[PDB]
């Protein structure tokens, strides 16, 4: 059935979107607002009053203090705008390289494993966003490995803190330990923790 | 006397082509030249393949000059904000061996 | 004086000035001669204007700007002071203004 | 407890959102070892050069910094329609 209207111009719209991406900062936020709204209309996740972080009655056990406080350092209160935003960011286009909100963990206590788990969950619930911030999380993971596995860390870093895939698809580790800026995300460089090379 | 003088008798004589004793401004007053890559001022080159004479090198006064300056985008001397993050335990800090 | 060209009523002055400007060795100019954009932000940062100003003041002003610019330190380097005045292994995040 | 709500509901929602008109880029391939974003500029002979993806650091939009801690409320402070009398359209 004919509709008396112009065809949707795929080519011209993709071009104008590229131009807007290059010129219009609000654009990223525009698009997120659609997705985010959709998530809200899917009625898929809501905050509750009741937290569930600790088994009873481990929160009451005296030995658990150094653990409990650690978890309480990480656990943000639920807020639907932020939760929906975390959901939407997975599928909205990124026009300004995202950065991890820096963690200051030094990894002395065993309880510090919490931060590592927080990354793992984040790698699972949101593989895309994780893939965007993964080098900056590698910088925390290195302070983790150097404290828990100093020998393996020595060997790993000695191979190289980062790599660059070439033609033929082979990896070439830098051989050089160095902190990874997000300035590298647009570069040929990759964090080396995620090479999955034995 | 009148070492400072740059111009004299800015009036036209109605008979002779220029007044006796009238003095034109030195050409150096008007050569904006360039700013050197170093940041020192230069006069214009007097011939191709020749660099210009630095302005401070000689005794003439030049009254048009390039000045580098900062646009609004720079700013300096502003207080800047940070996030301090104190160590989780005082006993976990290490001093030696650095 | 270079601006008097084709504006001063005086004839000999106008002829002498037009001569000094038409000479190869000199060239008056006013306004924005040069521009330096940021490497990352792309916005212009340090622009060289051709002012009407004595070359001594221009030379000094350019010395100030040159010292400020060629130092290559930002306000992020300030955290290195905060690190010296706060307990060992304290942390300082952001904002990377560059 | 929460896994059914993710994998058997929210999964579908990503799958549909992934087809929305403006979600126009390949954000990830599933391979951390290899994936890099495709990168583009509006460039001209006349000297312009405009990256589509720039790194600029935190913006006014509030979109750039990512707190990973968001993962905690999700695991341990959120109802889902699938998880929680337990019938819910």
């Amino acid at each position: 059935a004919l509709r008396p209207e112009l065809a949707f111009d795929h080519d011209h719209i993709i071009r104008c979107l590229m131009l807007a991406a290059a010129n219009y900062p609000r654009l990223e936020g525009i698009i997120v607002q659609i997705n985010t709204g959709y998530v809200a209309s899917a009625n898929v996740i809501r905050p509750v009053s009741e937290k569930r972080y600790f088994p009873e009655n481990l929160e009451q056990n005296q030995s658990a203090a150094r653990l409990v406080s650690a978890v309480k350092a990480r656990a943000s209160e639920a807020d639907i705008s932020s939760i929906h935003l975390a959901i939407a960011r997975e599928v909205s286009p990124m026009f300004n390289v995202h950065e991890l909100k820096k963690i200051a963990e030094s990894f002395e206590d065993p309880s510090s494993i919490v931060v590592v788990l927080e990354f793992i969950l984040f790698a699972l619930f949101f593989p895309t966003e994780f893939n965007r911030i993964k080098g900056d999380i590698q910088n925390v993971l290195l302070l983790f490995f150097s404290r828990w596995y100093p020998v393996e860390y020595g060997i790993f870093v000695q191979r190289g803190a980062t790599y660059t895939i070439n033609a033929a698809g082979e990896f070439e580790f830098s051989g050089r330990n160095e902190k990874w800026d997000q300035a590298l995300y647009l570069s040929e460089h990759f964090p080396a923790l995620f090479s999955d090379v034995p | 006397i009148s070492v400072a003088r740059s111009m004299r008798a800015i009036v036209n004589h109605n008979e002779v082509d220029r007044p006796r004793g009238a003095v034109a401004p030195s050409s150096y007053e008007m050569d904006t030249g360039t700013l050197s890559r170093n940041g020192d001022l230069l006069y214009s080159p007097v011939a191709n393949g020749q660099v210009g004479i630095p302005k401070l090198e000689v005794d003439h006064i030049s009254f048009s000059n390039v000045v580098s300056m900062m646009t609004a985008n720079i700013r300096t001397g502003d207080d800047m904000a940070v996030e301090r993050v104190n160590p989780d335990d005082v006993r976990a800090i290490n001093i030696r061996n650095a | 004086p270079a601006l008097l060209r084709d504006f001063t009523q005086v004839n000999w002055l106008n002829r002498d000035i037009t001569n000094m400007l038409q000479q190869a060795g000199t060239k008056y100019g006013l306004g924005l001669t040069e521009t330096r954009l940021d490497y990352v932000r792309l916005v212009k940062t340090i622009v060289g204007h051709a002012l009407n100003i004595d070359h001594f003041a221009a030379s000094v002003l350019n010395i100030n700007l040159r010292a400020l610019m060629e130092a290559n330190v930002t306000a992020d380097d300030r955290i290195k002071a905060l690190q010296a005045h706060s307990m060992i292994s304290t942390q300082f995040h952001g904002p990377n203004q560059g | 407890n929460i896994a059914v709500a993710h994998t058997d509901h929210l999964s579908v929602v990503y799958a549909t959102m992934s087809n929305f008109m403006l979600n126009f880029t390949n954000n990830f391939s599933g391979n951390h070892a290899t994936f890099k974003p495709d990168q583009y500029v509006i460039t001209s002979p006349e000297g312009s050069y405009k990256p589509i993806i720039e790194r600029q650091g935190e913006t006014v939009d509030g979109l750039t910094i990512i707190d990973t801690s968001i993962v905690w409320p999700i695991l341990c402070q959120c109802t889902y329609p699938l998880v929680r009398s337990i019938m819910e359209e």
């Binding site: 943000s76 209160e77 807020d79 932020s82 935003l85 909100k101 820096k102 | 300096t76 001397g77 502003d78 207080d79 800047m80 904000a81 940070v82 996030e83 301090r84 | 306000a75 300030r78 955290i79 002071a81 905060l82 995040h93 952001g94 904002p95 | 935190e58 509030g62 979109l63 750039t64 910094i65 990512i66 707190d67 801690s69 968001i70 409320p73």
Partner: peptide
């Protein structure tokens, strides 16, 4: 505590 996507600034250095 509460989620925050920005840098949670809490000091100001003087020049």
């Amino acid at each position: 505590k509460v989620i925050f996507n920005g840098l949670d600034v809490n000091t100001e250095v003087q020049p």
